[PDB]
């Protein structure tokens, strides 16, 4: 019979690729359908370029793609409209904000699978050791704590120890970290939902100068090459006081054999001042049926299974990844395993989106501009002032004649 072929999460990041293969295999066994899993590069922008080769070819070789929250506007022509396959009641079981994100000119491109938000991981053992009772609420506090703890851990012989790790590589992940920096300084959303390119302002410039100030000081020099996993690996070995990352890192750090099991918490990322907005960049992945799949019915069935209550539950319990169904946030087993889901749910609901809605099919060009200009600040090539001016000009060229 048919072989349903799935381009799912990458095996190069955490456990999500192995887990998703196992879920697809379980669906295949449950339904008596042959399945195959197609692996991906780690970084989301590299994954998009891979999937675009299949789509440009109208290839029937992949039936189901796991797609980023930032992609619906780009990928819509390559997606089977799911709307006729779901009742309204089924659709209302997902957060409406994500269903809306996934809907482009009325086409339901994809089902919400798991959401994501940037958060602050912190070593609570080390905060206590050094006389701190809460994680930092301001970036100034984060810097002061990092400097003091670093000075002590280094003095005590840990030459690998750093204050903060984050995603500073030139790729999409830096756009996510930089939106948090800019927004949490009162610098705006880089491109506002109404289309105003707002990034050339002194608050955004400051945010980027501050991040430069970390590099080689409280963060490693090499942070300018770090993606999710490079950051995670320094953190997880016990060598960083703080890390900015997504929720998936929590389960991994609690696993048996993790050096930091039981030694950390999570909270909202800090901000420049009490009246700035909390910043957590909205991430997450959706499930798309290819417009080129020869087997739409079977592929839709698989996508509904993967998005189902019990599979999202398993994702939350085993991999600490965030459901797209509100009902899971009141499930006793989900909350017993991840009590921090309760405390941070509002942070997750208030997550700030990158400008994918307003940039539409041009988002990947806009994001490339953002990460390259930001990266040039982190490397010390440019100051924040110049970078936000240059970024404004690049985004104006890219979005010229684009209306949302
Ligand atoms: O790098 C930006 C990108 O980060 C997240 O996706 C990448 C991987 O992170 C996960 O560990 C989930 O947290 C994996 O499942 C993903 O493959 C984020 O979800 C994206 O929205 C974002 O563009």
From TrEMBL:
Pfam families given in the database record: SBP_bac_1
Q: Which family does it belong to?
A: Belongs to the bacterial solute-binding protein 1 family.
Its lineage reads: Bacteria, Thermotogati, Deinococcota, Deinococci, Thermales
Q: Does the keyword Hydrolase apply?
A: no
Keyword annotations for this protein, in alphabetical order, are: Signal, Transport
Gene3D superfamilies in alphabetical order: Periplasmic binding protein-like II
Q: Which domain of life is it from?
A: Bacteria
Give the InterPro entries listed for this entry.
Bact_solute-bd_prot1, SBP
Q: What is this protein called?
A: ABC transporter, periplasmic substrate-binding protein
């Amino acid at each position: 019979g048919p072989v349903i072929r799935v381009a799912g999460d990458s095996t190069a990041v955490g456990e999500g690729g192995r887990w998703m293969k196992e879920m697809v295999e379980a669906w295949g066994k449950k339904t008596g359908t042959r399945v195959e899993y197609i692996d991906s590069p780690a970084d989301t922008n590299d994954r998009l370029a891979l999937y675009q080769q299949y789509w440009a070819a109208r290839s029937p070789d992949v039936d189901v793609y796991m797609i980023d929250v930032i992609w619906p506007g780009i990928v819509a022509p390559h997606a089977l409209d799911l709307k006729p396959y779901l009742t309204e009641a089924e659709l209302k079981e997902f957060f409406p904000r994500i269903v809306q994100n996934n809907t482009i000119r009325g086409k339901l491109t994809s089902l919400p699978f798991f959401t994501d938000a940037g958060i602050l991981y912190y070593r609570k053992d080390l905060l206590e050791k050094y006389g701190y009772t809460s994680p930092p609420r301001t970036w100034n506090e984060l810097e002061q704590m990092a400097e003091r703890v670093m000075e002590g851990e280094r003095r005590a012989g840990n030459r690998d120890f750093w204050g903060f790790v984050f995603q500073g590589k030139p790729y999409e992940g830096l756009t996510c970290d930089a939106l948090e920096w800019i927004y949490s300084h009162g610098g705006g959303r880089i491109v506002e939902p109404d289309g105003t390119i707002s990034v050339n302002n002194g608050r955004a410039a400051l945010a980027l100068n501050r991040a430069h100030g970390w590099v080689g000081r409280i963060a490693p020099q090499g942070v300018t090459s770090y993606a999710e996993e490079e950051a995670r690996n320094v953190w997880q070995q016990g060598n960083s006081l703080f890390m900015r990352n997504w929720p998936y890192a929590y389960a991994l750090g609690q696993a048996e054999g993790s050096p930091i099991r039981g030694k950390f918490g999570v909270t909202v990322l800090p901000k420049a001042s009490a009246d700035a907005p909390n910043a957590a960049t909205l991430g997450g992945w959706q499930l798309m049926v290819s417009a080129y799949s020869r087997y739409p019915k079977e592929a839709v069935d698989l996508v509904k299974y993967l998005a189902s209550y019990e599979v999202q539950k398993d994702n939350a319990v085993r991999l600490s990844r965030l459901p797209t169904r509100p009902a899971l946030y009141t499930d006793r087993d989900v909350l017993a395993r991840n009590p921090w889901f309760r405390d941070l749910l509002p942070v997750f609901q208030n997550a700030v989106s990158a400008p994918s809605d307003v940039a539409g099919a041009r988002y990947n060009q806009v994001s490339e501009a953002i990460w390259t200009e930001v990266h040039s600040v982190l490397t010390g090539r440019k100051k924040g002032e110049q970078a936000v001016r240059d970024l404004e000009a690049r985004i104006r060229r890219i979005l010229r004649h684009h209306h949302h």
